[model samples]
Target chain A: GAMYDIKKWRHIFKLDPAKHISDDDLDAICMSQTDAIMIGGTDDVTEDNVIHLMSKIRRYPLPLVLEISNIESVMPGFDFYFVPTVLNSTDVAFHNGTLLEALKTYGHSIDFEEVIFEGYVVCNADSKVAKHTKANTDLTTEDLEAYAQMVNHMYRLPVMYIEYSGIYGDVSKVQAVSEHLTETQLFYGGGISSEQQATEMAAIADTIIVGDIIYKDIKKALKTVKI
Target chain B: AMYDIKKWRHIFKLDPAKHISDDDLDAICMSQTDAIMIGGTDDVTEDNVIHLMSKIRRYPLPLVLEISNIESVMPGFDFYFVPTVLNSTDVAFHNGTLLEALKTYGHSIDFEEVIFEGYVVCNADSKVAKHTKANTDLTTEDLEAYAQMVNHMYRLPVMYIEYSGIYGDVSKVQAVSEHLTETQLFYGGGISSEQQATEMAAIADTIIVGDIIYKDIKKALKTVKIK
Candidate 1:
């Protein structure tokens, strides 16, 4: 009952467990009118850190979710667990490696109700996560359409994330993906520092995720919630 | 007696209906701005007001939550600044909302933390203007009478000349403050830079710096530099 449908969320504040956030700063994030708080990072996301962040966030009432990057780092106590399938990653392991291993290790105990399969279209090539995941950064509107169609239509994934990672992505691309999508809930993330961009991306994407601004400028990061 | 805004020079009013960042919030709290104001015109809520309170409370300065609407009210602030619109044609802006607010919250209220503001909404396009249907077409004579009402008549603690989105008249602000005896004059609107801050800083007892905090934080910080 505490779990929230991701479709209703217009804005989400995505945090990295690897990075640090002050208690007071964390207070503002959870209290911010944001639809939810997402926990995940490309590098250095670990079990203890996840647990630590979870403990702090669980104190608040907003919906909490983990964008599962590694099976080892995935801990319990999440309202929802999003399994990211990097559809555009050159390495197929990024697409299935974590899930296959997760299922092999804990298939019997796995709760299907809490699990949500998300498809990530990594848009920023220079981002550390992009390089690590071996993502295909160079793509066009048509290329984005092909991926959106296959990810949402063919694969029938519930969620499709258009990730720019560390940099702000082109609005047109997200719009292109948005235009093609019919079933998938489109998620746009990267370099949303102001209410303008949060609103900018929030317009085309089903949900907008803002991260870098949280550490760089906590004030602007919170301002994104209203939009 | 618990708090006196007569000597305060600057306040950063943040909207809970909007999102904010850590660095921006840190700068606001750490900047030694006289106070941190939490309020917005359209979608203000208790959750958002509480969100800002937790972040700004850690800092040493005074934290004030202005009552924009009844639903946005929360108690933990050092002071509660209740904005009573002086220039609204509608009686609701003057009495209707306040009457309902008292009926619901009067049974348990800290009179020590309560402070009323004589609000003069000046921006026609501003959300507050539309919501309250505030009479923005005020002549210099009308402003003098309103200033007198806040100071000489019932003697509310502060007289806020709210420009909202548009910059205001310095001469008119200066004229109004001249008429005030004990009521502190607070000027807020189109202050996007330090120059405009200092312009009003010289006249009004306190300057409420808003919009720019969400735009350029550095520019917003410069308002604190005005001694």
Candidate 2:
């Protein structure tokens, strides 16, 4: 029996369009025992990319989730939607404006229950997401801990994401943030290349998200889904 | 005829919410600061602006209103420092807030009367820092790039390094100041004493004094006016 609880879903595979993985590569992912398939990217992603990716992965038995960067790419037929709200973003658009604009236009037709509020802290300065979002990536361990606590304790969000979108992050920072979090489901992403790295991150974060790795070897990427 | 901002050196930033006394206002005026910039991070109202302006107007120095929103903007001010947060992730911090102000008051305000400042907020605990989602972990080179882009690319008159309240590295200031020869460089954050102010004044074209003035008006007045 599949569990509906988010805490139960401990492993996620993030597929980005920019990585340019073929449909044949995704076939391996569909068969892999991962918790969920998150389709999204930082830059150069279009409606066509989402539509194309969705068509290939929709036949799989595993749950599918859409992590949208732009509001225009949002479409229906996903088991869940990871709606981003960058808590540490200086731009109101990323924090609230985008969501508000989306709501004003498509509020009536949208299903609120399927939406999973992702409180994002984009910590990788080199990543396109950091430049695009202008994220405050220069956080100390204490700062990271405070952000995690604020999202969980203050905002009462279900997901607390520490996204090192392109580069690998310091494990100590992740360890510190994990220690601070109590209820919020921790999602860590960036450089997960092998089973060793994936197993290490899985111990700390509820979900270890792999994106860039899938482009290299789908077999190695499948090994990262530590059950 | 408008006064040349390039000639002016030191600036005193007064917050109305700090409850500055009448004696402090007189002292600030007499201190011979190049200009007096009146604004606050929070609790700014039209009444507050009017009351503070009424008191400060009694003195003969140039009065510049650095407004956060259109609500606080009033006619009859000598000059306006329409600040824009350049590196803000929030649309409100960078463009939305400025756009709102412009839509409401752009017609009445003359282009010559306005001095646009591009702010890079770095203080982690400041209202602007939090609201803007300031990237505090910027390398000296990164700081230079942001300042250069604001001045050269955007063609803004002034580039301000707003550390908010926390004192930042003088080395970062030195790096940014060295890059800007044409545009006026302004720095504000954590100037609690005369020594700190003197060191900053050496690097930046104008050092803005705020919290220190409210804490000890006479002491701050003596230290910041290094010309």
Candidate 3:
């Protein structure tokens, strides 16, 4: 359903919300040919930080996708945007409202057609998503497939997202979803802390979202992907 | 200005979310209250905070922000209030979030030409209001010291005279006002009657009433008017 406004095989990474990266760190990452930059996070974001980040990155040509948690967080700039929708049939984050609001303010200059739909990824162990969503996995293979189908094709959504939630490492589930939703562009996030894992996911999923791991362990990002 | 506590009570309890629906604002304007305080205690999500304040602006009441953070502060507000969270080191501090606001939006808002009103905490238990949350050991003397700094040194837009524990000692309210010129005083929390509000209003630049009117939306205007 996604018209795919952005090109294929373009790697994207989510920056750590809590920590600030220096100019040197940013330059290093930029040199890696990162396709674009996603500037903020959900819980720790503020209007000031977002504006500061946008003002800084607006000078660059890379497509900046703001991962906003609230409607107030939406600013007038950004090349593209991604918001969380229903996860496993449960509303993990009400990003639907947030995006709707941004449209009102910024007036659709942003590429809404190329949306990144993030979904639930059952982590190897207890993950932030488990705590954030407040739901027990006990999720069966069938349930996950149904969810992948819903998150991908059912909603006629532009993108399909699956987060592993920093628990037990499982690449097969991500592969399953990537292959299951190949037509709709799949996203894989969480439990990925090293370059090999990033590259591994890159081999299977369309995009890899690394939060705490990349922000804190900057060294690990070196191996994730070239750009 | 001598106040009719009865008439003022009805007006003081107005909430921005439902401000236009009630006669409370008309009563407030009639009572000639210097200004109206606007905010909710729980700052859970940005949407709830922004929507409530936006609703209040629609009513066109002389708005004052009670929440200090930048995300919650809107451009539409007549003035921005900088609140120093009291009692808990965990909350916003003068050297913390305020610094953030200054660094981020200080230059951003100059174009709008909106008034800025800075606020301070008065929770006696070292447990509430926007104050130095570091020590519950702060005494009335400590409040006096902080009040002196906020009003004189910072020359803040405004300083609120608050008593989180009870109606502040009337004498102390006056003494704090004596701390600086062009400073606005505020009182909130346990004020239960119009007479008490009037008593505080005598010295305070503005008196705030919350739960009292919100709980009984019907009699809100009548209840807030100072008799």
Best candidate, lDDT-wise? Answer: 1
What are the per-model DockQ values?
0.01, 0.06, 0.01
Better DockQ candidate (2, 3): 2
Greater lDDT among 1 and 2 belongs to 1
Clashes of each: 15, 8, 41
The CA lDDT at A57 in model 3 is: 68
Candidate 3 lands at a TM-score of 0.44
Off by over 4 Å in 3: A1-9, A89-125, B1-227
Q: lDDT per residue, candidate 2, A95-130, as tens digits?
A: 755664565455546655677778788998777788
**Cα TM-score per model:** 0.49, 0.52, 0.44
Residues A151-219 of candidate 1 have per-residue lDDT tens digits of 554345678898888788999888888986777799889889988888888989988998889998999
Candidate 3 lDDT, A1-227, residue by residue in tens = 12225545356667754568776666666556666677656555777767766676666666778765556666657666666643432231231223334434543244434344454344433655555544445565544555555444323345666666553246776666665574567777676677767778777778776666556666777567742
Best by TM-score: 2
What ranges in model 1 sit over 4 Å off?
Answer: A1-3, B1-227
| Candidate 1 DockQ, CA atoms | 0.01
Which whole-number lDDT from 0 to 100 does residue B39 have in model 1?
71
All candidates: TM-score of chain A: 0.96, 0.95, 0.79
